[PDB]
Design an enzyme around this catalytic site. Structure first.
Site, mmCIF file in Angstrom:
data_model
loop_
_atom_site.group_PDB
_atom_site.id
_atom_site.type_symbol
_atom_site.label_atom_id
_atom_site.label_comp_id
_atom_site.label_asym_id
_atom_site.label_seq_id
_atom_site.Cartn_x
_atom_site.Cartn_y
_atom_site.Cartn_z
ATOM 1 N N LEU A 123 3.272 -29.032 59.567
ATOM 2 C CA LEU A 123 2.080 -29.539 58.890
ATOM 3 C C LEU A 123 1.292 -30.398 59.870
ATOM 4 C CD1 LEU A 123 3.654 -30.668 55.488
ATOM 5 C CD2 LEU A 123 2.554 -28.477 56.005
ATOM 6 N N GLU A 136 2.369 -33.791 47.417
ATOM 7 C CA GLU A 136 1.780 -32.493 47.727
ATOM 8 C C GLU A 136 2.858 -31.420 47.793
ATOM 9 O OE1 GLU A 136 0.745 -29.772 50.040
ATOM 10 O OE2 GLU A 136 -0.614 -29.462 48.350
HETATM 11 C C1 LIG Z 1 8.014 -26.051 52.449
HETATM 12 C C2 LIG Z 1 6.951 -26.236 51.365
HETATM 13 C C3 LIG Z 1 5.835 -27.127 51.902
HETATM 14 C C4 LIG Z 1 4.896 -27.425 50.733
HETATM 15 C C5 LIG Z 1 3.782 -28.379 51.157
HETATM 16 C C6 LIG Z 1 2.813 -27.658 52.093
HETATM 17 C C7 LIG Z 1 1.952 -26.626 51.365
HETATM 18 N N1 LIG Z 1 1.134 -27.065 50.423
HETATM 19 C C8 LIG Z 1 0.382 -26.156 49.819
HETATM 20 N N2 LIG Z 1 -0.495 -26.669 48.787
HETATM 21 N N3 LIG Z 1 0.358 -24.852 50.042
HETATM 22 C C9 LIG Z 1 1.179 -24.419 50.974
HETATM 23 N N4 LIG Z 1 1.188 -23.009 51.247
HETATM 24 C C10 LIG Z 1 1.995 -25.290 51.681
HETATM 25 C C11 LIG Z 1 2.937 -24.716 52.745
HETATM 26 C C12 LIG Z 1 4.143 -23.943 52.244
HETATM 27 C C13 LIG Z 1 4.989 -23.409 53.097
HETATM 28 C C14 LIG Z 1 4.746 -23.563 54.587
HETATM 29 C C15 LIG Z 1 3.697 -24.234 55.034
HETATM 30 C C16 LIG Z 1 2.709 -24.851 54.048
#
Ligand SMILES: CCCCCCc1nc(N)nc(N)c1-c1ccccc1
Length: 186
Positions: free
Chosen positions: A22, A30
């Site tokens: 990230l 989040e």
């Molecule tokens: C491992 C879960 C991380 C969740 C927080 C990051 C995140 N937020 C949103 N709103 N959409 C996404 N697609 C991702 C995300 C999910 C997986 C990998 C990278 C970013």
């Protein structure tokens, strides 16, 4: 099979990853929002399907793989079997969507959630049909090396609110962000 959806968290400069990490420090609420939205399925006896590219899969910390309570499908032309801990492998988004209508998955899948990365989002966003984008706007610039594709607002309407999605500004670790939902049908 139910609705097709993308879910993303994106910085002001459109960044979604820095070497897969990230771009911003981890934001606990989040993370919780992502888990809740992609896991929650109203249809009894079904789970949601998460679809992601190979790099997005390996960007998830191993302790968080597979995404629990969801069917995990990875897209790759190089891989010849699903990665350790994943459930399914397809060569392309089209093939993955075709698989959801095969008997192996037809009655198992409710909602489909595309969770990354850039090229998978782009293919979904530019394919005709009914699609929603769940977009977390991280309201700062962060150094990134992968980016969310442009949202064409001629076809994607920003919804005034959405059930289960907070409409007002959030803040964690000194970083303001907000949740948005976009919908197209073409
Ligand atoms: C491992 C879960 C991380 C969740 C927080 C990051 C995140 N937020 C949103 N709103 N959409 C996404 N697609 C991702 C995300 C999910 C997986 C990998 C990278 C970013």
């Amino acid at each position: 099979v139910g609705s097709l959806n993308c879910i993303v968290a994106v910085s002001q400069n459109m960044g979604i990853g820095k070497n897969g990490d990230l771009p911003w420090p981890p934001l606990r609420n989040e993370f919780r929002y992502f888990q809740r939205m992609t896991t929650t399925s109203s249809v009894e006896g079904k789970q949601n399907l998460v679809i992601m590219g190979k790099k997005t899969w390996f960007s998830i910390p191993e302790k968080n793989r597979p995404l629990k309570g969801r069917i995990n499908l990875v897209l790759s032309r190089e891989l010849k079997e699903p990665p350790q801990g994943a459930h399914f492998l397809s060569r392309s988004l089209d093939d993955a969507l075709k698989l959801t209508e095969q008997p192996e998955l037809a009655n198992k899948v409710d909602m489909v959630w595309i969770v990354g990365g850039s090229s998978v989002y782009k293919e979904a966003m530019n394919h005709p049909g009914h699609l929603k984008l769940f977009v977390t706007r991280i309201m700062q610039d962060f150094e990134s090396d992968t980016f969310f594709p442009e949202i064409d607002l001629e076809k994607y309407k920003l919804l005034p609110e959405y059930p289960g999605v907070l409409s007002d500004v959030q803040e964690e670790k000194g970083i303001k962000y907000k949740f948005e939902v976009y919908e197209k049908n073409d």
